[PDB]
């Protein structure tokens, strides 16, 4: 359809409004500290950001 | 009699003072702006009622929006409410005012319990 209904449904909040900043996944997001990264992607890159294991 | 006043007074009961006769949820609904879809549906029912023959019920009008709250000016219309599969035509009784349209087109049929299968050993 035209622009009046193609993206008409609001996504200004809710689970569909948020996606992973790496793989654009819509499940298991980590919004803490504005990380905005998927759980799998965070485990993949936590050494790179700097979250290292201590205990 | 919705709140002690008759239906005739409800027909000319404007929205601003009608919210003091609805419940809290309906009053909050009407306090927020009704979108263009609801206004279009209201115009459609008005058109159907005015074009309806005298002493005879109007024609059926269909809709997906079942979150519409019932207004007194829609009494007597033939409205077909979607249930997820088909449109269910339903009367607007003079007792249905504070109730949403979705309550009168069930989204499931009631279960007829049969013999249990392999489970629950």
């Amino acid at each position: 359809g035209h622009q009046q209904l193609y993206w008409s449904h609001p996504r200004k909040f809710g689970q569909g409004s948020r996606s992973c900043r790496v793989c654009s996944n819509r499940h298991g997001l980590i919004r803490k500290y504005g990380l905005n990264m998927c759980r799998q992607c965070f485990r993949q890159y936590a050494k790179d950001i700097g979250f290292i294991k201590l205990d | 009699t919705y709140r002690g006043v008759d239906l005739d007074q409800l027909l000319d009961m404007s929205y601003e003072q009608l919210m003091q006769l609805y419940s809290a949820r309906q009053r909050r609904r009407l306090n927020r702006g009704l979108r263009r879809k609801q206004h279009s549906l209201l115009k459609r029912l008005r058109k159907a009622k005015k074009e309806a023959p005298p002493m005879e019920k109007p024609e059926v009008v269909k809709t997906h929006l079942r979150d519409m709250i019932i207004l007194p000016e829609m009494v007597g219309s033939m409205v077909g409410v979607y249930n997820g599969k088909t449109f269910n035509q339903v009367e607007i009784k003079p007792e249905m005012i504070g109730h949403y349209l979705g309550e009168f087109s069930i989204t499931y049929k009631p279960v007829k319990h049969g013999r249990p299968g392999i489970g629950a050993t």
Partner: protein, 114 residues
């Protein structure tokens, strides 16, 4: 103040930038013997230092490819213009870089070697 975010969010954003830049350099400099990324940030400007083996390969004709990557990192993260510089550094003892050796092994396997 209000314009600047909290320190925790700032460190998180720095880590995000580091990881994203590392991923971009990995996917872009895979055939150029990429080793790793080192960034030096100052309030004046930022300095990004790439560790790689073939500096002459990552650098295009008269530094064409290094200019291309500098423009890419300028555009994507929205730095102030001229506040980022890209240095390509030749690594020491490239046999000690597991990234470079793994990429070389992948290159060998893609070549058809057993």
């Amino acid at each position: 103040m209000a314009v600047q975010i909290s320190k925790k969010r700032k460190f998180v954003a720095d880590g995000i930038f580091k990881a994203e830049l590392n991923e971009f350099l990995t996917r872009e400099l895979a055939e150029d013997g990429y080793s790793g990324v080192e960034v030096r940030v100052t309030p004046t400007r930022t300095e990004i230092i790439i560790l790689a083996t073939r500096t002459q390969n990552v650098l295009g004709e008269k530094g064409r490819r290094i200019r291309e990557l500098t423009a890419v990192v300028q555009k994507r993260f929205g730095f102030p213009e001229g506040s980022v510089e890209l240095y390509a550094e030749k690594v020491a003892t490239r046999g000690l870089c597991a990234i470079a050796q793994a990429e070389s092994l992948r290159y060998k396997l893609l070549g058809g070697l057993a």
